[PDB]
Structure 1
Amino acid sequence: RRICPFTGKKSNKANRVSHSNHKTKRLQFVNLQYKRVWWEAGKRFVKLRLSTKALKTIEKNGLDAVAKKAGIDL
């Protein structure tokens, strides 16, 4: 899915509007990109599929409280 497991960010059903007010659908979805972030409780890289807001959490708050906030780490 296009969801981030740490922070529950999903896609956004948000129309796009032209000049003559014509509206298509344009399902708008997050930049949850592949990374491989270091883990201090095992001193090792984990391969994750992280949104950039969740990236700012795991660098700001640390991966332990964010991963226990989501509930999953392995």
Structure 2
Amino acid sequence: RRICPFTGKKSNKANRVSHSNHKTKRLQFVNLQYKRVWWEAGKRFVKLRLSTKALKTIEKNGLDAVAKKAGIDL
């Protein structure tokens, strides 16, 4: 899915509007990109599929409280 497991960010059903007010659908979805972030409780890289807001959490708050906030780490 296009969801981030740490922070529950999903896609956004948000129309796009032209100049003559014509509206298509344009399902708008997050930049949850592949990374491989270091883990201090095992001193090792984990391969994750992280949104950039969740990236700012795991660098700001640390991966332990964010991963226990989501509930999953392995």
Q: Structure 1 length normalisation: TM-score?
A: 1.00
> Does 2:6 correspond to 1:6?
yes
CA shift, 1:73, in A, is: 0.0
CA distance in 2, matches of 1:36, 1:2: 17
Please list every run of 5 or more consecutive structure 2 residues that lacks an aligned counterpart in the other structure.
Answer: none
CA shift, 1:35, in A, is: 0.0
Root-mean-square deviation over aligned CA pairs: 0.0
Give deviations 1:23-71, integer Å, cap 9, x for gaps. 0000000000000000000000000000000000000000000000000
**Number of equivalenced pairs:** 74
Q: Structure 2 length normalisation: TM-score?
A: 1.00
Please list every run of 5 or more consecutive structure 1 residues that lacks an aligned counterpart in the other structure.
Answer: none
CA shift, 1:15, in A, is: 0.0
Give deviations 1:5-26, integer Å, cap 9, x for gaps. 0000000000000000000000
